[PDB]
Amino acid sequence: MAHVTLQSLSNNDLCLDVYGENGDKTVAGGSVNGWSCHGSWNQVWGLDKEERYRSRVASDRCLTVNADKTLTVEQCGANLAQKWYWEGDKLISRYVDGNNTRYLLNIVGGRNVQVTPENEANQARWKPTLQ
């Protein structure tokens, strides 16, 4: 498995970053958003055999689409909300709902990163960058 940073190509310096909870980067349920690139453990990810992006902050922390379309790290499971695949420079969630849309990883403003309907995902270019 390749350890990578997930660096935005829609912003001059933003990487996908485990904010954590109250300084604690290792906590289950910790928030994920954007930050200037520095490649510390909370910015390194690995894509496993189940299409989950595992964080290097600790064991058993997977990038997770939440109901409100925000991002956290959570214990790894089988949910499609934890599955990801690439199409060119688009990073797409396998998450499904009644809206008949694919959801793309996308900068929604400032350092906020969420998933956004494909048609409306305007800052959704990423590069998996080998550490």
Added chain:
Amino acid sequence: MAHVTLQSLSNNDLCLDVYGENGDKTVAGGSVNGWSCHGSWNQVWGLDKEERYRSRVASDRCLTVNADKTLTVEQCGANLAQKWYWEGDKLISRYVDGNNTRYLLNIVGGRNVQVTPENEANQARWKPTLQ
């Protein structure tokens, strides 16, 4: 032969699952429907050389299309109702009837899984996943 789980890509957590008959998963004629993924043996399957999906619940149990379009596990034979092939993420039965239609493995509501005429199969995406 590769042992796989058959996970839905049309539902955020559904796998093809041997319910059995009265809690007994090994019974011939036991029901097959959907359930959340946990990869126990009643959710593991193997596609043999005769295009049958063998269940790991016990020997000689093949995924079978019934006349009412529901699914069971039965003793393995030559019937087309036990034969399956992939097209992309669609899992297609070789079963024929008087409808000039192919039948696709499909979620028809809740955790109910059946085969549905191709034109009407709108929750019929699956991913075979190595165990």
Added chain:
Amino acid sequence: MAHVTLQSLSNNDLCLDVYGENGDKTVAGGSVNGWSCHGSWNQVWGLDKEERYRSRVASDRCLTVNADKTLTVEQCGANLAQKWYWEGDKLISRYVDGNNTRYLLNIVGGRNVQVTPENEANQARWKPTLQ
């Protein structure tokens, strides 16, 4: 040479089968038709270098189209009535006559296998199946 059964994809359970004559399945001139699949000696065939389908029932027995379009096993010779080729899942005779048509291995009714002019051959899908 691959030894196969010839199973219909147009009928849920029918294989090309040597019936024989009066119980005797080794006799030249023995009848060929449809039966449920069991893979026993009288359902096993092999396509030779001369495009003949040889039967496992005895040496020197070839699948043969007759005048009236029924099928028998006969001694192997050079006649086009004994030559067969595949186009996708269609199995076609090289037999010629004055009727401006190709003849396809086909099911008419439910139990009777014969060859049929192509344009009327509505249940003519087959699968050569190893073992």
Added chain:
Amino acid sequence: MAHVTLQSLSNNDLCLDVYGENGDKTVAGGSVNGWSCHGSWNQVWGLDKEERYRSRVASDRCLTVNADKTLTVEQCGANLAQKWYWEGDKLISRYVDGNNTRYLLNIVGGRNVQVTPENEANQARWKPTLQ
């Protein structure tokens, strides 16, 4: 050089056959026509580097278009009337004349084989069959 029989696909049992003259199959000028296939030497042919079809009846016997469009075996020379090429199942002579036409090996009635203008050659399908 691969030796073949030249079997018709427009007739259920006809091969190109050196008749000879008065029982002698080896004689120069000997007639060529059709016969049921038996694969003896007077039905075996080889395409040489000059595109001549050499008969196995004897040395130096090539399939030759005569001025009346009948066929004989003759001593091998450079004339286009001895040159042949395939195009699908059509076997075409390089013979030229003022008729703006290609001449195809063709059954013209019964066991008579001649070459015929392409737009009128109705029984002109052949298959070279390896021995």
Added chain:
Amino acid sequence: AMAHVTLQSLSNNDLCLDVYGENGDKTVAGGSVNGWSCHGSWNQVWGLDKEERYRSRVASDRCLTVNADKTLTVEQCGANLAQKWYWEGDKLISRYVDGNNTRYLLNIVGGRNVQVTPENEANQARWKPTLQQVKL
């Protein structure tokens, strides 16, 4: 392996991308980059690294960098898209982004001045990376 190249214009009969430096010193961080006639010295040799940065051979840790005013400098190497470059045929394209919905191309904007320019206006923007033997 990183190839040492000159970046020669195909839109001007004799212009290479060149570290001007400052005050005669070609090694300074923040030194200007523009065009000059080709001579292939170290301040004209470049190498594309695994992070898509064009490193100058003039000194360690000098990367071709798009500035806010679209001029070019060499700067200490980091992660910013302003230092990332990719080829499409003979166009050398910056990964720099802003609100103008455009790609920026390496472009001669007049005389020996080289900047990046919006794609639809980049008329002297053809380049050839040319393998250059480097003397130690």
Added chain:
Amino acid sequence: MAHVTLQSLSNNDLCLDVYGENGDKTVAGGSVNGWSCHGSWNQVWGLDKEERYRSRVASDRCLTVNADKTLTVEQCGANLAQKWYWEGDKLISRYVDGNNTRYLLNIVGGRNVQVTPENEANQARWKPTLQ
């Protein structure tokens, strides 16, 4: 270099032939025309690296297009009138004039062989045949 006869496919027996001058096949300026095929040295040719067809009649004799479009053998030089290339069964001269047409080796009547404008070259099929 591969020695060939240049045999016509537009005439049942014609090969490109060095006639010579006064019975002498070796003379520079000797005429080239057609003749029945016998494969003696005045009918054997070799295409060299300069695209010249060298005759085996004698050293330093190349097939040459003359201003009047007749053919000779001449001392080998650099002129395009001595260069030839194949497209399919057409043999084309590199010869140029102000008419902006390509010239093809062509039978123009009986055993007369010349070069002819491409559009009008109707007996211009050739086969380079290995000796």
Added chain:
Amino acid sequence: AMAHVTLQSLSNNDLCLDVYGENGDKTVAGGSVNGWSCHGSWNQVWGLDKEERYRSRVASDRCLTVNADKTLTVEQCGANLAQKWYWEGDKLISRYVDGNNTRYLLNIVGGRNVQVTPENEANQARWKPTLQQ
């Protein structure tokens, strides 16, 4: 080790690119280049180097050069696009640029005169790099 080629026209039955030189001296810098019948002497032999220059065998350091007025000379070798050449099929195309926004092609412009000509006017512009060795 550059392959020895002549640059022979396919638009004229016998014309090669040829260093005329000056007053019989084929080695001189700024020597004129035009056409002549093909004889393969060193003033007609060329080599394409790694910088896309056609070097003449008349002397060290002599490259085929497009001049401002579109005539051709041999000159000391340098980096100028005016000395760079590439092939597309039987067209030999210069990298020279100017204000006209055209590619320039090696072209016969009358008798033995060879220049470069704008692409869409170049009617005697077919060439074959012909191997000598």
